Amino acid sequence: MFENITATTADPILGLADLFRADERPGKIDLGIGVYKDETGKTPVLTSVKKAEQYLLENETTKNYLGIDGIPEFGRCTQELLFGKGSALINDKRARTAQTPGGSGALRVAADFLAKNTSVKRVWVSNPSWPNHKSVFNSAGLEVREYAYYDAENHTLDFDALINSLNEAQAGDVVLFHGCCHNPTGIDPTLEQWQTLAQLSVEKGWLPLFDFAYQGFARGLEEDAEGLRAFAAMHKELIVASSYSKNFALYNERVGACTLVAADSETVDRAFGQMKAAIRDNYSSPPAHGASVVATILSNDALRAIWEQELTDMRQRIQRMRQLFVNTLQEKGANRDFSFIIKQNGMFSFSGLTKEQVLRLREEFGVYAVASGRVNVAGMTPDNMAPLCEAIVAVL
Amino acid sequence: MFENITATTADPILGLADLFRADERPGKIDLGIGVYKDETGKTPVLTSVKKAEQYLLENETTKNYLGIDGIPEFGRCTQELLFGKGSALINDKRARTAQTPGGSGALRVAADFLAKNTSVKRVWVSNPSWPNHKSVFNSAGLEVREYAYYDAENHTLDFDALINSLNEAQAGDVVLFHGCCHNPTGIDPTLEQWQTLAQLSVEKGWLPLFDFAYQGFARGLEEDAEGLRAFAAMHKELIVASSYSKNFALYNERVGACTLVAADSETVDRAFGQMKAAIRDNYSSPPAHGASVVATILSNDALRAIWEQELTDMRQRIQRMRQLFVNTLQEKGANRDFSFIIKQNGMFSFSGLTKEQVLRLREEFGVYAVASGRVNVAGMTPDNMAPLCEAIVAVL
Ligand SMILES: O=C(O)CCc1ccccc1
Ligand SMILES: O=C(O)CCc1ccccc1
Q: Could you say which of B158, B211, B224, B307 is catalytic?
């Protein structure tokens, strides 16, 4: 049965770790997968996470199965982060949260739930795009269409092209939005743009799906949720697939959430029953450790303030690497204006490298960016900056 | 888009956790979900597990993503536990293991893999079966057929009927076997029957899939793997969905494995690529914490001797409860001979109780069993035995 299985296209991002590891060039540099690094080029455990885990070591008395939807206090903390403490969504009990294995898990759960229980047939995603969106949604039998998003001459959100692109999108189509730190462009709608989009989505009868993996990385926790909250103020229904992988540097514990919102409690509770059925046929119930850490941190005043400052330190270091990055490129002999890189949010820099230029950075310099030309600014340090910028300049 | 979604109960068995929880009667007894309890009626974290978490707290330096297939040492330890240390499957590099969130996650991964990459159309499952086998495989678009298994008269394998009912299983069909402690019946093939079954499937051209969640709970670690290894010795191709939820009392950390076996190394690597693609389309990569614990324990000599003793203590306690259970059924004047229960492997007794008797147990006595009549013997203590036995006696 297995002799004739055909090999797959390597994943443009995930496949990068093996290719990087196998490269024998001394001085190779990994700017691929979006993991935050410190000044030393390490990805450490957060001290607030270590404190929470020590707490769990001392105090946990069982590993008994969580509910299918996970730790209740986790869902409750997720909803405050997403919607704001005194939110009308929370007071009206209009939202149900399933703790999932990562925002990835939340995406797949959303996709299965929608394919099995609704009339949804397509999801609209942005180009440039995050590859797993089309992969996850297609696997659940959903068709995926692209909307336009980016002006590549100006390195700007092309707002009219976004809207014109979606003239197409019908009532009961899903439209996917990145809550902040658009992956890969780093360009986000303004508040006013978020409000226009929200109003258009209501009028068009779209079902909004927010992929929210970077809360805290654009401007800060509350300001990063403005876009989502503006959609939340307008809509009877939406889904949020959120992650704690990046904001807690908890990548490998797979901590995320699928939040369902509907017009009232009755409806959301009833629809959430079928979300649980979608999880049943998948991984059955979610992993306790990472979510308990996040719930422990978010529930304790003192721990939370420790985490919040760690998060801003992460964000400030990336801002510093972005200034250093555009400065070093100039100094290494790039003509070009690269100031547009300073105003991209999140972990990445995106300009306009072709696949050919990316492959050359790799073969010739051992510098690994993603096939799309996306570079991990958060993987840059004062020590790799010079060789990495020299590599980039040579391929321009 | 959500208003017409219909009320449902998701997982029937996990659904019992809630039914049990919401019940306000103080003498309620839980005999549903297969979770081990100690003498005090608690589900403690294992000492070996606490020791491992302690080590991890003290020594982990990163939460950077695992590879799609998880911790390499976890994979190694799994295949050794599965196939034996000297195995030709290991030396010949014919097996690839992905760490998954539970054996449940492994079943889903296996099903998507098959649905997507092979011409497998149907999966044959025992009668009776674990309920989630059917819904998992159906969710991936695979027909599920039933084979004869349990002789509900002799409380025995109806082996000849099993072979008759599999006559129509075609070359390239999947046949699902439980590695040991068949759930729910507690009746496993003998080694000789396993050997007959291994011969037949080679002859018939079936793809065997093993659900192996109870290694160590029938007779012991190596003894329980005998059926699997008799299949491994004969087959070109094979899939194992194994779990550490029960043997490490680690239910909520979601620790399992999907093992793929093919004829040679090139074949298994090319197909495993597509297994990785099925995971990428799903939760992307598995949770580190639980599997780290298991890898920590299995690769350190003293730590694993502590674990094996704890597992021995779990099995030995269950057997003492089985004996106490039939004896006190008798003493309470039971109107059927329940000595057949002594012969069942694992955590359960499949007792022959009807749906009516199950509902009356729940309603009159606050004793909660699975609707099939399966009761969790591992949830029985000396303290709850007499009340639960008077309950069963009254409904017979
Ligand atoms: O590099 C990224 O885009 C973020 C990390 C990631 C990559 C692929 C799947 C899940 C998370
Ligand atoms: O009770 C059982 O059959 C074992 C525990 C379990 C139940 C449902 C999903 C995963 C594991």
A: B211
CA B273 remoteness from chain centre: 26
Query: Does the active-site annotation cover A246?
Result: yes
Whole-angstrom CA distances from A59 to A56, A62, A296, B291 are 5, 10, 12, 21
Catalytic residue among B124, B130, B206, B307: B130
The yes-or-no answer on residue A28 being catalytic is: no
Rg for chain B, CA atoms, rounded: 21
The experimental technique behind this entry is: X-ray
Measured CA distances, B381 to A100, A232, B41, B214, B376 (Å): 34, 50, 6, 21, 11
For the domain spanning A45-315, the CATH number is: 3.40.640.10
Ranges of each domain in chain B: 11-44+316-396, 45-315
Listed residue (B108, B166, B168, B172) closest to B139, CA to CA:
B108
Q: Quote the minimal CA–CA distance from B168 to chain A in Å.
A: 18
Taking CA A304 as the corner, what is the angle to CA A299 and CA A308, rounded to the nearest 5 degrees? 145
Q: Do B2 and A277 touch (CB under 8 A)?
A: no
Q: Count of residues for chain B?
A: 396
What's the CATH number of domain B11-44+316-396, 3.90.1150.10, 2.60.40.780, 3.40.50.10070, 1.10.1060.10? 3.90.1150.10
CA nearest to B251, candidates A367, A67, A292: A67
C-alpha–C-alpha distance, residues A47 and B268, integer Å: 41
For tokens 């090999």, the residue is: A7
